[PDB]
């Protein structure tokens, strides 16, 4: 019950360039249900070879 | 005079620091939507027949 808020807080840091979260960290939160969905858990990638793309973040308008 | 195990704790407190959510405004774009291509005013014909 803290994973959603943590993911949203981390996404707000990267968007507003707060803390030291790299502007390009991927905060992923693969939810867990009872179904055979992808393995659950909060990943956070910041490695130097991933592909990224810009999108206008609504609720903040901060790209 | 040594250290002995004492009574089991009755509870646990876990502290974390968290900020809150603002209002939903959803300001999608500076100049928004795909603005349509359109007619230059008046224009005028730039060609005539012979005769």
From Swiss-Prot, chain A:
Gene responsible for this protein: POLR1B
Organism annotation: Homo sapiens (Human)
Role: Catalytic core component of RNA polymerase I (Pol I), a DNA-dependent RNA polymerase which synthesizes ribosomal RNA precursors using the four ribonucleoside triphosphates as substrates. Transcribes 47S pre-rRNAs from multicopy rRNA gene clusters, giving rise to 5.8S, 18S and 28S ribosomal RNAs. Pol I-mediated transcription cycle proceeds through transcription initiation, transcription elongation and transcription termination stages.
SS bond partners: none
Compartments reported by the entry: Nucleus, Nucleolus; Chromosome
Residues of the whole record sequence present: 569 to 631 of 1135
Subunit and interaction comment: Component of the RNA polymerase I (Pol I) complex consisting of 13 subunits: a ten-subunit catalytic core composed of POLR1A/RPA1, POLR1B/RPA2, POLR1C/RPAC1, POLR1D/RPAC2, POLR1H/RPA12, POLR2E/RPABC1, POLR2F/RPABC2, POLR2H/RPABC3, POLR2K/RPABC4 and POLR2L/RPABC5; a mobile stalk subunit POLR1F/RPA43 protruding from the core and additional subunits homologous to general transcription factors POLR1E/RPA49 and POLR1G/RPA34. Part of Pol I pre-initiation complex (PIC), in which Pol I core assembles with RRN3 and promoter-bound UTBF and SL1/TIF-IB complex.
Disease note: Treacher Collins syndrome 4: A form of Treacher Collins syndrome, a disorder of craniofacial development. Treacher Collins syndrome is characterized by a combination of bilateral downward slanting of the palpebral fissures, colobomas of the lower eyelids with a paucity of eyelashes medial to the defect, hypoplasia of the facial bones, cleft palate, malformation of the external ears, atresia of the external auditory canals, and bilateral conductive hearing loss. TCS4 inheritance pattern is autosomal dominant.
Description of its domains: The active site comprises the fork loops, the loops and the rudder that stabilize the transcription bubble and assist polymerase translocation.
Family of the protein in this entry: Belongs to the RNA polymerase beta chain family.
Coiled coil region boundaries: none
Protein name per Swiss-Prot or TrEMBL: DNA-directed RNA polymerase I subunit RPA2
UniProtKB/Swiss-Prot annotation, chain B:
Intrachain S-S bonds: none
Regions of compositional bias (Pro residues) in chain numbering: 29-41
Transmembrane region(s): none
Protein name: DNA-directed RNA polymerase I subunit RPA34
Location of Phosphoserine modifications: 26, 34
Entry similarity comment: Belongs to the eukaryotic RPA34 RNA polymerase subunit family.
Physiological role: Component of RNA polymerase I (Pol I), a DNA-dependent RNA polymerase which synthesizes ribosomal RNA precursors using the four ribonucleoside triphosphates as substrates. Involved in UBTF-activated transcription, presumably at a step following PIC formation.
Domain of life: Eukaryota
Quaternary data: Component of the RNA polymerase I (Pol I) complex consisting of 13 subunits: a ten-subunit catalytic core composed of POLR1A/RPA1, POLR1B/RPA2, POLR1C/RPAC1, POLR1D/RPAC2, POLR1H/RPA12, POLR2E/RPABC1, POLR2F/RPABC2, POLR2H/RPABC3, POLR2K/RPABC4 and POLR2L/RPABC5; a mobile stalk subunit POLR1F/RPA43 protruding from the core and additional subunits homologous to general transcription factors POLR1E/RPA49 and POLR1G/RPA34. Forms a heterodimer with POLR1E/RPA49. Part of Pol I pre-initiation complex (PIC), in which Pol I core assembles with RRN3 and promoter-bound UTBF and SL1/TIF-IB complex.
Compartments where found: Nucleus, Nucleolus; Chromosome
Spans annotated as Disordered: 18-41
Note: It is in an antisense orientation to and overlaps the gene of the DNA repair enzyme ERCC1. This gene overlap is conserved in mouse, suggesting an important biological function.
Species annotation: Homo sapiens (Human)
């Amino acid at each position: 019950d803290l994973a959603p808020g943590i993911a949203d807080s981390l996404r707000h840091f990267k968007v507003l360039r707060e803390k030291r979260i790299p502007p390009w960290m991927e905060v992923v939160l693969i939810p867990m249900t009872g179904k055979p969905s992808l393995y659950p858990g909060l990943f956070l990638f910041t490695t130097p070879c991933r592909l990224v793309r810009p999108v206008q973040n609504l609720a903040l308008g901060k790209e | 005079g040594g250290l002995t195990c004492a009574s089991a704790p009755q509870g646990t407190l876990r502290i974390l620091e968290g900020p809150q959510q603002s209002l939903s405004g959803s300001p999608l774009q500076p100049i928004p939507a795909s603005p349509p291509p359109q007619i230059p005013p008046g224009l005028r014909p730039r060609f005539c027949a012979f005769g």
